[PDB]
Amino acid sequence: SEESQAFQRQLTALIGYDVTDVSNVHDDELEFTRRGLVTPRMAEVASRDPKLYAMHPWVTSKPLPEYLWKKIANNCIFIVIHSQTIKVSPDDTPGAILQSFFTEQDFVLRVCGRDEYLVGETPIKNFQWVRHCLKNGEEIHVVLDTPPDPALDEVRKECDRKFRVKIRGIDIPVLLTVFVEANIQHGQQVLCQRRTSPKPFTEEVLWNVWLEFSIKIKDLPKGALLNLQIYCLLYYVNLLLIDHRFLLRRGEYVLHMWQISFNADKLTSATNPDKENSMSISILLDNYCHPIARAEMPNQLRKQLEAIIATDPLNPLTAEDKELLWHFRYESLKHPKAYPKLFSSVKWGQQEIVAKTYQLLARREVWDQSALDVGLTMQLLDCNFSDENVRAIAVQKLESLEDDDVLHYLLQLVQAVKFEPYHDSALARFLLKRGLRNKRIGHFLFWFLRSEIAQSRHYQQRFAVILEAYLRGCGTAMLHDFTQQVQVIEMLQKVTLDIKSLVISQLKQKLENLQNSQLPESFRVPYDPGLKAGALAIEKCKVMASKKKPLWLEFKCADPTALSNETIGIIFKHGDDLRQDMLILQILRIMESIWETESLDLCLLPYGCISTGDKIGMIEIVKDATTIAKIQQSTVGNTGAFKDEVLNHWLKEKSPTEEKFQAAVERFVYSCAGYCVATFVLGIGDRHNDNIMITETGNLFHIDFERVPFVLTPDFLFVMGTSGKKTSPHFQKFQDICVKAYLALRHHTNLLIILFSMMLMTGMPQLTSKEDIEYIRDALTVGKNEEDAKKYFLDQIEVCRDKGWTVQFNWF
Ligand SMILES: O=C1NC(=O)/C(=C/c2ccc3c(c2)OC(F)(F)O3)S1
């Protein structure tokens, strides 16, 4: 169409990148992938009931946790249907709740303020909103609303020769000894390895040398990088030996490399988009090779095996371990927790060994019959595995996750796509399907993919191709929403940057001029999709106090049925890599969920945090909170240290009645406990102060994501009810929690270890493929007993009490 490229313009703008360019590719994997993604899309758009879709019910299946049952150990729940109030049972479908208020079905129980319909054949107690209400001890509130017109959700239609490589040379516009080290990799595991003679290092360098590897053209497994690096390690680049059609790479190539400043960036098929000042490498791949496509173990070794298949995912495998693990393939193949180690003990450098492997996978029943382990399913999707079949079973076990869990793991999964050898993968296609199936999962997919496309040259093209596929299947409604969301931010970030260049005088001046006619009618809060936003309470927008000059904006709720005058806060900031916070906040919701399995609870406060571009993004404003210092600053501050009894007064003072003060201290121990266990494990316990806040309601929470395990300042202890070497009745509950929460995590050592490791490889700069990760093994005290550890954390608890303020004063 001569108007079709206008839609594409719509996409391009939503995406933030152009999946139509081609000045930075050397094949058609991206295109072929766009072409290939159409089937997965249709297969989903089509297989999706327009009814429940357009309404996106949000339910769970996990058993209702104790703490929330206790708050209703009387089997009774009232649902105020807009003001005739009803009382339902923890087992009544939205219909039963419709039976009452009514005694034609063109009505649906929507929620006041948000976009959260309590529709669908689901048990009342199985609605996230309902449980949220139970959590916040609030009261449910619906509204006789007419079910949404899905029409708006219509998707606009449409040889045995040894491998050799020729290294011509490297060119750079503007820059000693330097060599090129080609490496035939697979699973981030080097195989062969050939180099070059250390010639001079200048703007141009010709070697014209063929590099004859040992691996035979056959031995080459699909998904084996041709890693080219330059040493004097300054620049690197990769090439997929076998391309997306199983064919083998053959030809002349001129690759533009990435410069170094371990991590997931070093894995990419993408070349540098900046051919203006980036290093170049010339290589030649000329050829005419063409593509392709019992008994009983003893009794002492089996023990050796079970021992191995029982250690953490970190524990390295000795050459001995491996040879053993593979010789007993069919036994190791019985224990699922053995897959990772087992498939990491395969020699992909041998068509024959690999051959067996594949024929070994067809014999997997115990696996596809065993209980789904996310921590184990995740280990199979990391950097250590580059084989389609290996990774596919893992993706097959994920296909079982209900939405609630596909959201609890979305970010980490979307980040895992950086470990996929090719753009079209079961994982991407999996993300794609669940995106289109549920609008909630789709909304976050959108922003998770966008954050990367906006700052990852390394992974933007591939991500830009997975989003496009999504933006063309979600419906016309959403596409409008995303357009409105993207506008607001692109604008608001401009304001943010300006006000940083230097205030409150030109602040509202610029703000006010913004609402004028730019700021849309009502936009969706990117971190909480079920909340619209209108004009800004300009008279409330400011600029926080700090070297960083974040923007404290507050909007009004564009909703009438909303039973409150409450505002929608939003903190925009430039200067921090909010992509490390998102990941850390994600891990937090995971522990905030693990604990639930054991009905435990720590009242964590993971606020919304959505990256948006380079060193910038949005943050959620947590109502009625204050930074730990601002409290100990009104009284002291400046050059003065702190006050022991300041914080405790801040609670009783900042809380009416006595029925509110103790609560404010009750929910203060759990929260204190929660962030101590959490940060301790996450290895980020040594935090200053302005980086730690608490609510007038008692909930404390960290922010901005000679030593100590964590911050439990005497104040916290004070509030608990202890001056020092003692033990208040609450300090006990504190411990009665911590250990019960800390040991509840050890129950997932493997999971926390696989996420931690993945977080570092795709969230931080360069990553210590060794240490930095082993830190979590230590913290969780892997291997020891349900006691040595319990004491371990306690000794930690001590050091924090033993040091009073040793660092709080230092932090300079
Ligand atoms: O400059 C900053 N960099 C960050 O990462 C910040 C985090 C933060 C998150 C939630 C909050 C908050 C602050 O104060 C609040 F009460 F608004 O609730 S502030």
Tab-separated table of N, CA, C and O and ligand atoms in Angstrom, residues 544 546 548 550 552 571 573 576 578 581 607 619-627 693 701-705, ligand 1:
chain	number	residue	atom	x	y	z
A	544	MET	N	13.851	16.644	43.288
A	544	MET	CA	14.444	16.109	44.499
A	544	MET	C	15.811	16.662	44.775
A	544	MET	O	16.507	17.097	43.867
A	546	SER	N	19.516	16.417	45.418
A	546	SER	CA	20.629	15.497	45.189
A	546	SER	C	21.485	15.831	43.961
A	546	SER	O	21.042	16.533	43.054
A	548	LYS	N	22.051	14.161	41.664
A	548	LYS	CA	21.204	13.763	40.553
A	548	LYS	C	19.996	14.666	40.739
A	548	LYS	O	19.579	14.907	41.872
A	550	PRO	N	16.543	14.331	39.832
A	550	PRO	CA	15.341	13.596	39.433
A	550	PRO	C	14.138	14.529	39.404
A	550	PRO	O	14.158	15.602	40.015
A	552	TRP	N	10.242	14.876	40.372
A	552	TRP	CA	9.110	14.392	41.138
A	552	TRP	C	7.832	14.939	40.523
A	552	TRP	O	7.452	16.067	40.798
A	571	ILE	N	8.690	9.370	39.470
A	571	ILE	CA	10.001	9.991	39.593
A	571	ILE	C	10.892	9.722	38.393
A	571	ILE	O	11.437	8.639	38.258
A	573	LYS	N	14.288	10.082	36.234
A	573	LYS	CA	15.676	10.351	36.558
A	573	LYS	C	16.659	10.071	35.438
A	573	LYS	O	16.482	9.117	34.684
A	576	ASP	N	21.448	7.284	36.144
A	576	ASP	CA	21.648	5.941	36.687
A	576	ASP	C	21.215	4.872	35.698
A	576	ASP	O	20.360	5.106	34.851
A	578	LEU	N	19.129	2.354	35.457
A	578	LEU	CA	17.933	1.750	36.041
A	578	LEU	C	17.617	0.340	35.559
A	578	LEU	O	16.574	-0.197	35.884
A	581	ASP	N	18.386	-1.968	38.504
A	581	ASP	CA	17.370	-1.880	39.540
A	581	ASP	C	16.181	-2.765	39.187
A	581	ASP	O	15.620	-3.444	40.051
A	607	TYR	N	8.906	-1.106	44.285
A	607	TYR	CA	8.226	-0.083	43.511
A	607	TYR	C	8.471	-0.263	42.032
A	607	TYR	O	9.445	-0.892	41.625
A	619	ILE	N	10.465	5.885	37.750
A	619	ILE	CA	10.372	5.238	39.057
A	619	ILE	C	9.054	5.557	39.749
A	619	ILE	O	8.527	6.660	39.647
A	620	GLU	N	8.515	4.577	40.455
A	620	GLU	CA	7.265	4.775	41.163
A	620	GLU	C	7.416	5.544	42.476
A	620	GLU	O	8.377	5.349	43.232
A	621	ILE	N	6.463	6.429	42.736
A	621	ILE	CA	6.475	7.201	43.968
A	621	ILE	C	5.674	6.458	45.029
A	621	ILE	O	4.459	6.279	44.896
A	622	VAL	N	6.366	6.004	46.068
A	622	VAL	CA	5.716	5.295	47.158
A	622	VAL	C	5.140	6.294	48.159
A	622	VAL	O	5.877	6.948	48.905
A	623	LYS	N	3.812	6.401	48.160
A	623	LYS	CA	3.088	7.308	49.035
A	623	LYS	C	3.525	7.341	50.499
A	623	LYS	O	3.836	6.312	51.100
A	624	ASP	N	3.529	8.553	51.050
A	624	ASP	CA	3.889	8.846	52.438
A	624	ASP	C	5.175	8.237	52.960
A	624	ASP	O	5.212	7.748	54.084
A	625	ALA	N	6.236	8.277	52.166
A	625	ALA	CA	7.501	7.723	52.621
A	625	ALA	C	8.544	8.822	52.820
A	625	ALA	O	8.390	9.945	52.326
A	626	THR	N	9.606	8.488	53.549
A	626	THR	CA	10.679	9.437	53.843
A	626	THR	C	11.987	8.687	53.872
A	626	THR	O	12.010	7.523	54.242
A	627	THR	N	13.073	9.348	53.493
A	627	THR	CA	14.375	8.704	53.529
A	627	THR	C	14.824	8.663	54.979
A	627	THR	O	14.598	9.604	55.737
A	693	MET	N	14.452	4.059	52.746
A	693	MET	CA	13.261	4.765	53.212
A	693	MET	C	12.281	3.920	54.032
A	693	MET	O	12.423	2.707	54.131
A	701	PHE	N	12.031	0.348	53.242
A	701	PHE	CA	12.455	-0.235	51.965
A	701	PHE	C	13.649	0.465	51.341
A	701	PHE	O	13.712	1.692	51.323
A	702	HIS	N	14.599	-0.306	50.826
A	702	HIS	CA	15.784	0.285	50.196
A	702	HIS	C	15.477	0.911	48.836
A	702	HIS	O	14.383	0.755	48.308
A	703	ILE	N	16.450	1.631	48.285
A	703	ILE	CA	16.285	2.280	46.994
A	703	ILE	C	17.623	2.537	46.319
A	703	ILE	O	18.677	2.276	46.887
A	704	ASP	N	17.564	3.065	45.105
A	704	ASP	CA	18.760	3.317	44.310
A	704	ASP	C	19.603	2.040	44.297
A	704	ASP	O	20.467	1.844	45.141
A	705	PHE	N	19.325	1.172	43.330
A	705	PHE	CA	20.030	-0.095	43.191
A	705	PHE	C	20.917	-0.163	41.955
A	705	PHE	O	21.218	0.859	41.334
B	1	LIG	O1	17.143	9.566	43.092
B	1	LIG	C1	16.612	8.469	43.259
B	1	LIG	N1	17.108	7.283	42.675
B	1	LIG	C2	16.334	6.151	43.023
B	1	LIG	O2	16.601	5.021	42.617
B	1	LIG	C3	15.199	6.460	43.906
B	1	LIG	C4	14.345	5.506	44.354
B	1	LIG	C5	13.028	5.688	45.052
B	1	LIG	C6	11.972	4.631	44.829
B	1	LIG	C7	10.757	4.726	45.417
B	1	LIG	C8	10.489	5.882	46.285
B	1	LIG	C9	11.406	6.824	46.499
B	1	LIG	C10	12.738	6.754	45.876
B	1	LIG	O3	10.952	7.810	47.343
B	1	LIG	C11	9.524	7.512	47.330
B	1	LIG	F1	8.969	7.689	48.575
B	1	LIG	F2	8.904	8.369	46.436
B	1	LIG	O4	9.317	6.129	46.944
B	1	LIG	S1	15.171	8.202	44.245
